[PDB]
Amino acid sequence: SSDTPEGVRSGAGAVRDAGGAFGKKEQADEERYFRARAREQLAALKKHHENEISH
Amino acid sequence: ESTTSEQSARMTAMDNASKNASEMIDKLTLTFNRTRQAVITKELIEIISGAAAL
Amino acid sequence: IDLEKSQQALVQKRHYLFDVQRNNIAMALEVTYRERLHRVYKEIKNRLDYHI
Amino acid sequence: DKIRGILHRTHSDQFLVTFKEVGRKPPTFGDASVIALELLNSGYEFDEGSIIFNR
Amino acid sequence: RKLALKAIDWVAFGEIIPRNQKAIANSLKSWNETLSTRLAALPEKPPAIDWAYYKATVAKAGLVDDFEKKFNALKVPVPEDKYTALVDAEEQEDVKRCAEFLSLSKARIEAYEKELEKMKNIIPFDQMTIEDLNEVFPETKLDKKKY
Amino acid sequence: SVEQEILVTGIKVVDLLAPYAKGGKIGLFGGAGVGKTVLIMELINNVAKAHGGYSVFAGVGERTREGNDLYHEMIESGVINLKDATSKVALVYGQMNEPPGARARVALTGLTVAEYFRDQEGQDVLLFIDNIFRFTQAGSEVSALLGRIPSAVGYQPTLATDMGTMQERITTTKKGSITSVQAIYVPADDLTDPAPATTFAHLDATTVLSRAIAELGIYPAVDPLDSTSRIMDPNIVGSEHYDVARGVQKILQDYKSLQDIIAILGMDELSEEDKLTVSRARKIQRFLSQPFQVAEVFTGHLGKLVPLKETIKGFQQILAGEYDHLPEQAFYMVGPIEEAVAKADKLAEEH
Amino acid sequence: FRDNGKHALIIYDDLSKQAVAYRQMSLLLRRPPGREAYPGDVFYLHSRLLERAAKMNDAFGGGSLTALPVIETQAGDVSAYIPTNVISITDGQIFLETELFYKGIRPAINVGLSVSRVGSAAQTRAMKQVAGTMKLELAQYREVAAFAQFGSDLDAATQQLLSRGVRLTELLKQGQYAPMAIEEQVAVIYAGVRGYLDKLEPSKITKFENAFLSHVISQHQALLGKIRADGKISEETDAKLKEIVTNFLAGFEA
Ligand SMILES: Nc1ncnc2c1ncn2[C@@H]1O[C@H](COP(=O)(O)OP(=O)(O)O)[C@@H](O)[C@H]1O
Numbered sequence: 001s002s003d004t005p006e007g008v009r010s011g012a013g014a015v016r017d018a019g020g021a022f023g024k025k026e027q028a029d030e031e032r033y034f035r036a037r038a039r040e041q042l043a044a045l046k047k048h049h050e051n052e053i054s055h
Numbered sequence: 056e057s058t059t060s061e062q063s064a065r066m067t068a069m070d071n072a073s074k075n076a077s078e079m080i081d082k083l084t085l086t087f088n089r090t091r092q093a094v095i096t097k098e099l100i101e102i103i104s105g106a107a108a109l
Numbered sequence: 110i111d112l113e114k115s116q117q118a119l120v121q122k123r124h125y126l127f128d129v130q131r132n133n134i135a136m137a138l139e140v141t142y143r144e145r146l147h148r149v150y151k152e153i154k155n156r157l158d159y160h161i
Numbered sequence: 162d163k164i165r166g167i168l169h170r171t172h173s174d175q176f177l178v179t180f181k182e183v184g185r186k187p188p189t190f191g192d193a194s195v196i197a198l199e200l201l202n203s204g205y206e207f208d209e210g211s212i213i214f215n216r
Numbered sequence: 217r218k219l220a221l222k223a224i225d226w227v228a229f230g231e232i233i234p235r236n237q238k239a240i241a242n243s244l245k246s247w248n249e250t251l252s253t254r255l256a257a258l259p260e261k262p263p264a265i266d267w268a269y270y271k272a273t274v275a276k277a278g279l280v281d282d283f284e285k286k287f288n289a290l291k292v293p294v295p296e297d298k299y300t301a302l303v304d305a306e307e308q309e310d311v312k313r314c315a316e317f318l319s320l321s322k323a324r325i326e327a328y329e330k331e332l333e334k335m336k337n338i339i340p341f342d343q344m345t346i347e348d349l350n351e352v353f354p355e356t357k358l359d360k361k362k363y
Numbered sequence: 364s365v366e367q368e369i370l371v372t373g374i375k376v377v378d379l380l381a382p383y384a385k386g387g388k389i390g391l392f393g394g395a396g397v398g399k400t401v402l403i404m405e406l407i408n409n410v411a412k413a414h415g416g417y418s419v420f421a422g423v424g425e426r427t428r429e430g431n432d433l434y435h436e437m438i439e440s441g442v443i444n445l446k447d448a449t450s451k452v453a454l455v456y457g458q459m460n461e462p463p464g465a466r467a468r469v470a471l472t473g474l475t476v477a478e479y480f481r482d483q484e485g486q487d488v489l490l491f492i493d494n495i496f497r498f499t500q501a502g503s504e505v506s507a508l509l510g511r512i513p514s515a516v517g518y519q520p521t522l523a524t525d526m527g528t529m530q531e532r533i534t535t536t537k538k539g540s541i542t543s544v545q546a547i548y549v550p551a552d553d554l555t556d557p558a559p560a561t562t563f564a565h566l567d568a569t570t571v572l573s574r575a576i577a578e579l580g581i582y583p584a585v586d587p588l589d590s591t592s593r594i595m596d597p598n599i600v601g602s603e604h605y606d607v608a609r610g611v612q613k614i615l616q617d618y619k620s621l622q623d624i625i626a627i628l629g630m631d632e633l634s635e636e637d638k639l640t641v642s643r644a645r646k647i648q649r650f651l652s653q654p655f656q657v658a659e660v661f662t663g664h665l666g667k668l669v670p671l672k673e674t675i676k677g678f679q680q681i682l683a684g685e686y687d688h689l690p691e692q693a694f695y696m697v698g699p700i701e702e703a704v705a706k707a708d709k710l711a712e713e714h
Numbered sequence: 715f716r717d718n719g720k721h722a723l724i725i726y727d728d729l730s731k732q733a734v735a736y737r738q739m740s741l742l743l744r745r746p747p748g749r750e751a752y753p754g755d756v757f758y759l760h761s762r763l764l765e766r767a768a769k770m771n772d773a774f775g776g777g778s779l780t781a782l783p784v785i786e787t788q789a790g791d792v793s794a795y796i797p798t799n800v801i802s803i804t805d806g807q808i809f810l811e812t813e814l815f816y817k818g819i820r821p822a823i824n825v826g827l828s829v830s831r832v833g834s835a836a837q838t839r840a841m842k843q844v845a846g847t848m849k850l851e852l853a854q855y856r857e858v859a860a861f862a863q864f865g866s867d868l869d870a871a872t873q874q875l876l877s878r879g880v881r882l883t884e885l886l887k888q889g890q891y892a893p894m895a896i897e898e899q900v901a902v903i904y905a906g907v908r909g910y911l912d913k914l915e916p917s918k919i920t921k922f923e924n925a926f927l928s929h930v931i932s933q934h935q936a937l938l939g940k941i942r943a944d945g946k947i948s949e950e951t952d953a954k955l956k957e958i959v960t961n962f963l964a965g966f967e968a
């Protein structure tokens with residue numbers, strides 16, 4: 001099919017638009033990884049010394 | 056030894072994941088081609104039946 | 110030998126670049142005179158275009 | 162990592178140390194010295210042992 | 217119009233060698249490429265002013281021709297050349313300073329050339345002298361050679 | 364007329380990647396239930412009260428309830444006045460309870476009142492039309508009884524002629540100017556249907572809404588890689604706005620091709636260089652979402668209105684890397700970039 | 715203009731809105747429909763319009779007529795009714811994608827699917843010599859484009875094939891309303907296909923090109939008159955162009 005202009009060819013971003021098993025396995029892996037980065041970037045954001053003097 | 060045992064099994068397990076994804080890719084190509092013909096056939100009947108009853 | 114040519118290297122370098130400074134400023138007056146003759150035709154072409 | 166992640170349920174209290182970031186770059190002899198140094202200076206004085214791997 | 221040529225901007229004119237100032241010499245070549253294209257944008261002669269068609273097409277007369285009578289006999293004075301001489305003035309002082317290597321190191325060349333003459337003289341016979349070999353290889357005062 | 368301008372609205376997705384224009388035809392695409400009526404309710408809120416001249420709203424084939432939430436959200440804002448002669452809005456309504464011969468002559472009645480102000484007077488007129496898919500559909504129902512063979516998927520044979528006979532009166536002439544915003548229903552999320560895919564030739568700025576963005580929580584769900592304009596032009600919007608717009612679309616499209624790898628490999632097995640272009644892209648997705656004013660009863664949040672000079676300066680600093688020390692949640696539903704760090708500290712203290 | 719010994723060009727913008735304006739006239743005259751309600755003679759509508767483009771010979775005048783039709787597909791499906799009629803009539807297609815338009819490639823011509831069946835017999839001798847290797851060099855890159863996202867453990871030939879393919883791509887990008895000359899086009903390709911760019915950083919290939927072109931217009935005008943008038947690139951001009959891109963590349967970054 002794909003070895004001609006006529007046949008169907010796949011583009012970029014076609015695993016998420018399908019919405020199947022691999023399309024759901026990708027959304028819950030971008031969220032369970034960038035949930036821990038909202039922990040380490042928020043715990044180290046409390047280490048401002050001027051806020052502690054106000055505390 | 057363990058980084059050779061691991062790097063050879065990554066070679067095999069990524070090889071059967073491209074055979075099973077190419078075995079699956081021909082079976083959906085036939086169903087795509089039956090369904091592509093069946094839609095040109097179906098919407099051709101609706102135009103003919105619309106003109107004949109008129 | 111290497112310090113004899115070090116004399117002559119700076120006397121062909123200097124006379125080239127001290128005439129480049131002559132002609133890099135020489136082009137600066139032609140392109141501001143050519144655009145002086147051209148612009149005085151442009152603002153009298155506007156009146157040749159307006160009243161028609 | 163994937164040894165610690167599997168055994169995190171049944172044997173979470175029998176761990177000594179865990180060494181991550183292993184296998185991305187090829188292993189060298191300096192990393193065999195970093196691990197073996199910290200197996201001594203931990204406070205755990207042992208008397209036998211064994212190693213399991215995939216030859 | 218008028219247009220004079222220049223010399224080759226190939227090797228020397230971009231290697232002026234300031235105190236690590238290759239950026240100032242790079243800017244010197246960048247002005248020559250910009251002005252030569254601006255001279256290639258406009259020609260030496262501008263367009264011609266048709267006078268006869270101005271009277272009929274703009275035939276509401278008086279106000280049309282009075283601007284065409286005042287703008288015809290005008291003159292365009294170009295800018296001054298006051299900065300043209302002082303930049304060329306510092307080239308005359310530096311060219312007198314650039315020959316100081318040709319003035320001072322010329323005796324340093326001949327003194328090094330005369331040093332090659334006496335250096336042939338010293339080696340002489342294998343078994344020559346214990347003081348003529350005491351010019352190149354050194355001697356000193358008390359307690360210099362540690363080892 | 365031939366001159367082009369830029370009309371500023373205050374929405375961050377619209378002014379950055381697909382700017383609207385004075386006297387230019389604007390289209391609002393998208394399916395059913397994504398926000399075409401709310402986004403066309405937002406531009407009456409911002410644009411119509413700061414505008415000098417008059418305004419006309421033609422409602423063609425929509426719910427008769429929603430013609431009463433406009434008559435009661437324009438008395439309490441003083442645009443319609445019931446006591447004297449200082450009103451600024453006319454209204455023409457033919458809704459979805461009418462016979463199908465009457466949903467196809469209402470849009471011709473809207474742009475007849477709006478042709479009087481442009482021609483017999485000289486003012487600057489606006490025109491809001493929702494919906495306009497119900498002009499095509501209401502002519503595909505009376506067709507087969509008039510004696511016509513159907514074309515492709517079921518529309519009339521004269522589909523692209525009477526559409527192009529109405530859409531050539533909504534123009535900017537040398538006697539006035541008509542800004543026009545139109546909502547265009549796309550049937551069952553398919554922009555290759557013959558009714559929405561022939562209106563593209565009559566629109567300058569298209570704002571394609573999408574259900575794949577709206578189901579993330581990003582509101583307004585505007586597709587950045589599917590919205591265009593005719594004035595995205597570095598000689599019109601300046602060279603600083605132009606290299607920011609294409610800098611956003613290039614990092615979003617390169618984010619699309621990276622999702623195909625994470626589905627098999629994972630997030631952590633990637634390199635450190637493209638763990639950063641994902642985290643810069645996810646902050647650009649979330650920063651585009653802005654809390655609207657007329658959607659207060661949905662949200663409870665307040666209405667923000669970011670100016671044009673601040674929208675560019677907000678997006679230069681996420682791309683250059685001046686906010687790599689914040690989590691993703693600090694940009695969700697904020698106004699300008701100043702509130703993105705004030706919201707960052709307030710989340711920190713509750714640990 | 716073809717009948718009187720002159721040359722011409724025509725652009726149909728666009729032919730996919732003529733088959734629709736003709737279908738409406740058919741079904742209102744009660745003609746028998748066909749696939750997608752088009753009549754039986756929509757192939758005969760487009761064939762006798764494109765066959766009027768011809769290259770006449772010297773006994774009739776030597777005229778010509780060149781035809782460029784525009785066709786809009788829907789969702790990139792060229793296997794529809796009208797996108798398959800006009801494909802089988804004409805000679806070659808230029809396939810502009812939407813994915814490459816947002817990835818930075820502008821004009822977004824896909825050279826994997828674009829062909830021309832007059833071939834290399836319509837190129838000048840200067841352009842034919844350098845682009846024959848560029849076409850082979852780019853085609854080897856598109857084989858290995860799928861290794862770029864995670865590739866560092868590959869062979870040095872494969873790292874080289876990626877290194878030339880990215881830098882040849884940056885030469886192909888071009889702003890709007892800036893058409894070049896063939897003598898300036900062959901010089902920029904000659905700078906890339908020889909190997910004079912594999913050490914320059916891939917982001918600087920655009921800034922290097924706009925700097926290099928404004929140089930050779932003013933300071934090497936007498937070389938771009940001996941490729942325009944000659945038509946070919948000789949051995950004398952091969953050496954003369956060789957020290958030019960070595961002089962500019964030496965002192966460039968300033
Ligand atoms: N500002 C907003 N952002 C995102 N979604 C909204 C907004 N306002 C309304 N919606 C959602 O859009 C849906 C449909 O709203 P509406 O625009 O009235 O319908 P339609 O677009 O189908 O005419 C509602 O269910 C609502 O949840």
Ligand SMILES: [Mg+2]
Binds near residue numbers: 399400425
């Ligand atoms: Mg609605």
